[PDB]
């Protein structure tokens, strides 16, 4: 059970078609898979779902909170409510043109953006509490794996590089970053990397502190802990698999991108996956190298 995600902070409408169309190969390849929308915008979701599951999910006043039970905010209540275990029972629906499961978004993730800075905060300050909050993300993964409901997850995030879609990446087991090469794309993707070094470190005391704290406090922590996919599926943390092109700075993006898969794990690799401009020619090459690193094994 593997989480890929394509992190940006440029942020726009072909990270997200990136994303769908790698999840459709990796579907092709003979693999259920999961995609979790968890960008407010909705993109993925308005994307792989038709009309008739659209207005299914947000179909008057107190009925509209029914849709809040058929997305993703769902696995969240019970982490809102003081619980520390998101809500394994979800249930996400097929999607006909991509052939993928997915767990349809929902605008109301603004409230929850806030539920994980403020735990994020918490966890700063040794919290055990909150710290096994900002897990939610591996925890999906493994109530997945652990009822083998699927073999890969998408994890798509928006633009915004904040206290929540931190919590994202410490979900996934690795991830792609997908630029623009123009001027302020690339300054962008600059300050990117400078943000991972940032935060990574900022999680490596969080992590180290709140567990050398529990521990003095129980022995079954060790246990306690499990639902959370700490370090991903071989423990090794968040991996770096490299970038995509959608010139100039062929060689700054290259540079930068070292950064950022040296700032993380050591598995990380810096490559260029491919550029994205009859058109499938271009994607399959992508698609296709984001699954053989995420796959070395036939």
């Not at 299914?56 to 809040?68: F, H, K, P, Q």
């Not at 129980?218 to 968040?238: H, I, M």
């Not at 991996?239 to 794990?265: H, P, V």
């Amino acid at each position: 059970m593997r989480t890929i995600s394509f992190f940006n902070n440029k942020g726009g409408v072909g990270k997200t078609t990136l994303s769908t169309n790698v999840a459709h190969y990796f579907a092709l390849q003979g693999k259920r898979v999961l995609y979790v929308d968890c960008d407010p915008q909705c993109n993925a979701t308005q994307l792989m779902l038709t009309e008739e599951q659209t207005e299914s999910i947000y179909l008057d006043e107190v009925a509209e909170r029914n849709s809040l039970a058929k997305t993703v905010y769902a696995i969240f209540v019970p982490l809102r409510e003081g619980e520390s275990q998101i809500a394994a029972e979800i249930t996400p629906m097929r999607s006909e043109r991509f052939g993928v499961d997915v767990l349809p978004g929902h605008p109301a993730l603004s409230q929850i953006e806030d539920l994980m800075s403020d735990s994020w905060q918490s966890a700063l300050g040794r919290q055990t509490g909150p710290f096994r909050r900002i897990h939610w993300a591996g925890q999906l993964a493994h109530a997945m794996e652990r009822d083998d409901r699927y073999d890969v997850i998408f994890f798509d995030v928006g633009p915004s590089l904040g206290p929540f879609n931190r919590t994202v990446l410490l979900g996934c087991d690795a991830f792609v970053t997908p630029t623009a090469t123009d001027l302020f794309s690339f300054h962008a993707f600059g300050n990117l990397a400078r943000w991972f070094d940032a935060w990574v470190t900022q999680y490596a005391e969080i992590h180290e502190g709140n567990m050398a704290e529990w521990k003095k406090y129980s022995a079954d922590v060790e246990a306690k802990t499990r639902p959370l996919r700490l370090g991903g599926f071989d423990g090794e943390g968040l991996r770096y698999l490299g970038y995509t092109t959608l010139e100039r700075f062929r060689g700054r993006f290259a540079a930068e991108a070292e950064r950022i898969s040296n700032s993380l794990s050591k598995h990380s690799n810096s490559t260029l996956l491919g550029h994205v401009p009859a058109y499938a020619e271009k994607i399959n090459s992508v698609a296709a190298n984001v699954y053989k690193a995420l796959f070395p094994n036939e």
